Amino acid sequence: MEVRNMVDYELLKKVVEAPGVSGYEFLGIRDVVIEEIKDYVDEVKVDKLGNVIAHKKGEGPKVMIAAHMDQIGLMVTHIEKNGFLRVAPIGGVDPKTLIAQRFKVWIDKGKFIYGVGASVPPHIQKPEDRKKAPDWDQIFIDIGAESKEEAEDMGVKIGTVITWDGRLERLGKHRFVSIAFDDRIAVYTILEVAKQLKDAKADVYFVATVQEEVGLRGARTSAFGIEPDYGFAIDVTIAADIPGTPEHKQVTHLGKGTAIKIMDRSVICHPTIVRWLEELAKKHEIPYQLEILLGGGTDAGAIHLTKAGVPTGALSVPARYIHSNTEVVDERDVDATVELMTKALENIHELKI
Amino acid sequence: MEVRNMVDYELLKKVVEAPGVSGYEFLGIRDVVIEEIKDYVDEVKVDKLGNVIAHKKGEGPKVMIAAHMDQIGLMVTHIEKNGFLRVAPIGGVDPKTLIAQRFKVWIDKGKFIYGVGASVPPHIQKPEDRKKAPDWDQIFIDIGAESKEEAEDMGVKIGTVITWDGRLERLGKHRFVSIAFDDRIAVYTILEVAKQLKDAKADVYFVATVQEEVGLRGARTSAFGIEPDYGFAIDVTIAADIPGTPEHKQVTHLGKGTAIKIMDRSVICHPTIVRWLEELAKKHEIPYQLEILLGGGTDAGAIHLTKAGVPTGALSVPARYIHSNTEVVDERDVDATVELMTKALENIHELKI
Amino acid sequence: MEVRNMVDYELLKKVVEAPGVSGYEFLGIRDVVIEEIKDYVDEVKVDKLGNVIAHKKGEGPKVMIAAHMDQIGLMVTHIEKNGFLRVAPIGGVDPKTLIAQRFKVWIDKGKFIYGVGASVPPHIQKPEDRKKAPDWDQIFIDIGAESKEEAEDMGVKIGTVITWDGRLERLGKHRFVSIAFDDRIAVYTILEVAKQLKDAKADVYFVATVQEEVGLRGARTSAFGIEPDYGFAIDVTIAADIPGTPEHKQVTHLGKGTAIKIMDRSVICHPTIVRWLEELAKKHEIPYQLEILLGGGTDAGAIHLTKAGVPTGALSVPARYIHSNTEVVDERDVDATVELMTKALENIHELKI
Ligand SMILES: [Zn+2]
Ligand SMILES: [Zn+2]
Ligand SMILES: [Zn+2]
Ligand SMILES: [Zn+2]
Ligand SMILES: [Zn+2]
Ligand SMILES: [Zn+2]
């Protein structure tokens, strides 16, 4: 569990279990996040996009910290005549992982039924048989209903209703958390920062955006008013020590320290900030890694689209996986990000250049 | 839950949760099965192959009922230098389903750690990328260990250690059980029969074989002494109402009644028995379906390999799925099999021809 | 030569040179094996299948040790009009290795002529040219005859007549034997065990089966009466330290210690026995390796098909190769198997569970 106690098992659990997709019946997560942040922040407001803005009052430059909380999911597009639930693809999800088992379909907030639809109708052809990759039709999920009417009675209606579902378990008693890696974590890092934030050298606005994995632009909207005068965002992706993988990708992750995003698809970290963070980490002896991604966009990049033209830095939590099959995290990694980020906040007054 | 109460939720749960692979640390299931059967049978003995033989004393022909309890699993073949656990294929498992999440690796009886290894190293090629089907190398499972030494310390040793793992949930509040379909169910049907068996017109030997999904022959060995003078075995497979599927396969399953195996890969049900069971079902108004399989072998077929040359009939529980992604069952189906089988037992004296 | 003297050079030579295929003109090997075993066993009998049963009299459980001695070969199917000898495929032989040179065609016991037929008629096509893999027609062997009549005069008649042929040489003066790996070796291990067997805690029946590489079932027949009450069989296969080979296969063999078969295609070693042997090896400080195979069947598995339902363990001699091109063995490996097996025999009384 809390091997280092750096990450509370309870906080990680509450956030990871909460449904993803704010504003959606999965919105329970939105309420949860604000439930705890309000205790350590002067106030929290809900934006039009459902974005949550936490306001830390202090003197200094406005630093915006943005964490994404869109997670991933699947949307039912219609009900088959056989009472089977169909699904529509979402982005940030790989069809190859489609679904293997246990899917949570939310009929309503607090009302969900287990559904499975890991298998898609077999293709015809001995070679196509080899093709185990499902077609764009994706896969279908069965609510167990026998008729479309029954499915409707179940309360299944068009609109994203299904979430990946999973369980938080500890892998490697020495360290490592399961589905804690995406979804929540960065949000967890933001919560921890607020908790340990005492002397505010600079006031920090915490913004949790939605639709970050898809429609990241919406996240930018919250960033628009809060992100002015600097901002940081935390998303994570990793090529990590996998067999058959070249060293060039292994360097992407090592399961140690933390990762500072040198550049991403949408944000080329302002060199001073990237370089500066590196300096800061060494001074405090905080472990860090330099990670560059060839693809993927972060909310930080979205912040870069603000008309303010504010530079953005990014922090990364190494030990990335994809949500569909895994989401292993490094306990140290979550801690490393929080520690580095917290110190950086005070330093930001000088750090702002 | 017990919508019809035909299948107790508790009994189904205990059997499905028990690990699969008797004699193996998964052997906990073996003990469980005998734990309950001993109360309703005069005695239970453990064979050399770990097969369990329940002896119902009565007067009449010896009828052997055989249920398989091998389930499916994966075996670690070695420990990678990176501390990753590797796996070796088992039979009755489809690589395409490989593993999506949460895998249970048993270090010892009662000691297991969660492991994940749903993803296999990406292939090189834009088209091979489409190929989402993993190679024979199969997939690898990470125990979260960082070093082979650590993995060994974890207690991971060569030998099948991993089980699919899953959770028993109710799908369709109207009916349907998740991972209850394979593994346990038929065994459950056998237990229920014993429980409701009161007046024994004929003595019935209940044999639970192991290595049925693989090395079905071993199951035959138990059948060798017990199966003499008739025997029945229950395994299940279904082509069931799936979209894009031709009607010719839909007829295989309908999620109603039960299924009598007309013929399988290894057993051509003795026509009299198949026909006879049909007659019996109609007389008692028990729903039934005639199912023929083009492939797959049942333990009943294995019984057919006895030197006695005893004919074997087979009962099937419709609503088949594969263990890797699903295992939906029909509550009615479990009930239908039990009801039909129980009545058949007494009728067997006349029925034996 | 006898670097450790663990394996006599003379015994290895006599067995490896003897022709393979008992009952066949290659049957000379059958006589040889019984020639030496009779001196250390109370008696030897020839079964109907040509199987040889050695009877070690002692008190205790009956332990059956089975070694295969079918080797591999090729059968002439007809005589071409050009006087060329044709061949039919055998199983356990890879066409790709077909034949490179020097083939021994037995016209009669003690009468053989050298024949070559490493090349098969070239295919037509610049790309098919690349295909160096011969077709199912396999390859043809020339007895040097110019006419079918001459070939017949030579005494070439339909029926497997040809053996791979080879020479026993020492590779690596430090250790390693050539064509000693398959064919003979396990048989050699059985002979050595009998020789060093003095105090018989348990009586051991030694059975040498035939048609093990093909028609392994026949081997089971001898096992049927002798294998009752436990049995062990030794066959070998290796993925061994080959370049371009992944570590996951390298672990299969290391050219050190011996290999205990955890599971094979047909036998899932009884866990207690596998585990037990491991315990025994450590106690006596005998080197061992755990090897699992994804394919291949061993005679031990065949023993598992006995109606007795007797559990079987298996010992493996690492450093496997295929008979067609190589058959390198580790001298230590042959010794390790013998040492471990001999101690196990006495322990078997307690070991039997
Ligand atoms: Zn994501
Ligand atoms: Zn993310
Ligand atoms: Zn199965
Ligand atoms: Zn089954
Ligand atoms: Zn061979
Ligand atoms: Zn062999």
Author numbering:
A (entry chain A), B (entry chain A), C (entry chain A): 1 to 353
Question: Which of the paper's sentences describe this entry?
Answer:
We apply the integrated NMR/EM approach to the dodecameric 12 × 39 kDa (468 kDa) large aminopeptidase enzyme TET2 from Pyrococcus horikoshii which forms a large hollow lumen encapsulating 12 peptidase active sites. The dodecameric assembly forms a tetrahedral structure with ca. 12 Å wide openings, one on each of the four tetrahedron faces, providing access to the ca. 50 Å wide catalytic lumen. NMR and EM thus provided structural information about TET2 on very different length scales, but neither of the two techniques by themselves allowed to determine the structure at the atomic scale, owing to the lack of long-range distance information in NMR, and the inability to build a robust model from the EM map.
We use cryo-EM maps with resolutions of 4.1, 6, and 8 Å (the latter two were obtained by Fourier-space truncation), as well as secondary structure and distance information from MAS NMR and solution-NMR. Despite its large subunit size of 353 residues, larger than any protein assigned to date by MAS NMR, we achieved a near-complete NMR resonance assignment in a reliable manner, which allows the residue-wise determination of the backbone conformation, as well as hundreds of experimental distance restraints involving the protein backbone and side chain methyl groups, but by themselves these data are insufficient for structure determination. An automated approach that jointly exploits the EM map, NMR secondary structure, and distance restraints is presented, that allowed us to obtain the structure of TET2 at a backbone root-mean-square-deviation (RMSD), of 0.7 Å to the crystal structure. In the first step, after detection of the α-helices in the EM map and in the sequence, the various possibilities of placing α-helical sequence stretches into α-helix density features are systematically and combinatorially tested, performing with each of these helix-to-density assignments a restrained-MD type structure calculation with CYANA. Subsequently, the correct helix-to-density assignment is identified through objective criteria that compare the resulting structural models to experimental NMR and EM observables. The refinement stage of the protocol, an automated iterative procedure denoted here as step 2, consists of iterative cycles of (i) a flexible fitting of the initial structure into the 8 Å EM density with iMODFIT26, and (ii) CYANA structure calculations. In step 3, a real-space structure refinement was applied in the XPLOR-NIH software, using the full Coulombic potential map, first at 8 Å, then at 6 Å and lastly at 4.1 Å resolution, and all NMR restraints, calculating the full dodecamer. Figure 3 shows the evolution of the structure from the initial model to the final structure, which was obtained with high precision (bundle backbone RMSD over the 20 lowest-energy structures of 0.29 Å for one subunit).
